[PDB]
Amino acid sequence: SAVPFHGAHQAGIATPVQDRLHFAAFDVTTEDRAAFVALLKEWTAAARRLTAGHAVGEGAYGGLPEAPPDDTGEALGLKPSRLTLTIGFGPSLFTRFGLADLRPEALADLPKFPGDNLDRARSGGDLCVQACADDPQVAVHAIRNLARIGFGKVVVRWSQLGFGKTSSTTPDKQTPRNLLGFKDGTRNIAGTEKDRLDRFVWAAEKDGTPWMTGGSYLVARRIRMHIETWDRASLQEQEDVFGRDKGEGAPVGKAKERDEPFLKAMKPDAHVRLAHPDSNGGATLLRRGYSFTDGTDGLGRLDAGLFFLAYQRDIRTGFVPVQRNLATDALNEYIQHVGSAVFAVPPGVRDADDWWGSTLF
């Protein structure tokens, strides 16, 4: 019902994937290093409260009537809902506070990719807060109140709501389906594989940046789907595009979803074949993305897709090689990348005296 906030790593990466997401990117408006560390400390205290289901500060009510409530109150009466709050630092942040020489080399700028159609307003950002919970209102309440505490020092650059499974009605032992209708997440790094997380996800001290040990690197991509075009393709084109059948999610020529794939039975430009580590030098990713549907656009189409989030030990050896291998993916007919950002995700908050970003500052 709650997920511990403290640890060697930040929660919300290897911890169980919650039902809903509210992802927020912030831009820093202050030049004062001290004012910013002060904010980071205030945020951590508030995050401790929020992840345990308490209001921030003095609470949402019952204080001096002449004062605004410390907490906007829309979460009163709700449970922690497995809220986790993960903070990340964007490349642009390291142009401030004299941190230029402390940018990790592993936090590489993404190249341009064939087909990219990036909306500059929903891209990048100085920092991010990933808010995962089973209740969308708990997640939003977290983002809202963190933005309120930071007003005057950070502004909200862009924001994205997402949903995955609804765990009160869907079994834990069941792969969710994305909005194209295929099972999503079958071949992924699991939170249980400590060895795989150490190899592919967590920054090692010998990786070159000491203050990032225990951290990870995050790639965010807002990926629109062309729903109405996808929905007119035959059942067979859809299955050809991924290399798995729609119903069971089995690799072509196998019987069960979790049969290991035989890559040569797939079409050379099938998604799974091109994304598989065997096609990419062993490059392996922890995917933790969410579906989104924001409404309908100007021509009556559904503005929906996948808010793709990947964690990895080094952007140069994780996302970048695999995304590059998708240049000729058959899926590309049906999707379009319209938003992008990278963040260095610092190590965890070790105890009640620690704070977000303490190793960097």
Binding site for ligand HEM (CB under 6 A): 178, 180, 182-188, 221, 223, 225, 242, 244, 261, 271-272, 275-277, 285, 305-306, 308, 319, 322-323, 326, 335
Shortest distance in whole angstroms from residue 97 CB to ligand HEM: 31
Q: How far is the CB of 258 from ligand HEM (least distance, A)?
A: 10
Q: Does 222 bind a copy of itself (CB under 8 A)?
A: no
174 counts as binding a copy of itself under rule CB under 8 A: yes
Q: What are phi and psi of 162, to 5 degrees?
A: -145, 165
Dihedral pair phi/psi, residue 301, rounded to 5°: -85, 160
Among residue numbers 322 through 361, which ones bind a copy of itself (CB under 8 A)?
none
Q: How far is the CB of 337 from a copy of itself (least distance, A)?
A: 18
154: left (phi over 0), alpha (psi -120 to 50) or beta: beta
CB 50 within 8 A of CB 59: no
Answer yes or no whether residue 223 interacts with a copy of itself by CB under 8 A: no
Output the smallest distance, CB 182 to ligand HEM, in A.
Answer: 4
Of 326 and 349, CB closest to ligand HEM: 326
Q: Which of residues 181-200 bind a copy of itself (CB under 8 A)?
A: 181-182
81 touches a copy of itself (CB under 8 A): yes
Q: How far is CA 223 from the centre of its chain?
A: 13
The stretch near a copy of itself (CB under 8 A) out of 42-50, 101-109, 233-241, 272-280 is 233-241
246 binds, among a copy of itself, ligand HEM, none (CB under 5 to 8 A by kind): a copy of itself
Among 102, 108, 263, 304, binds a copy of itself (CB under 8 A): 304
Q: Indicate the SS3 state at residue 220.
A: strand
Distance CA 201, CA 90 (A): 18
Stretch in the footprint of a copy of itself (CB under 8 A) among 19-27, 306-314, 319-327, 341-349: 19-27
- Scanning 6-14, 173-181, 258-266, 353-361 for contacts with a copy of itself by CB under 8 A, the matching segment is 173-181
Give the Cα separation of 16 and 152 in Å (integer).
Answer: 34
Question: Residue 325: how many CB atoms within 10 A of its CB?
Answer: 17
| Residue 9 structure tokens | 């790593």
Q: Which residue is nearest to ligand HEM (CB)?
A: 187
How far apart CA 323 and CA 334 sit, in angstroms, is 16
Convert 55-85 to b/e letters by CB count within 10 Å (16 or more is b): bbbeebeeeeeeeebbbeeebeeeebbbbbb
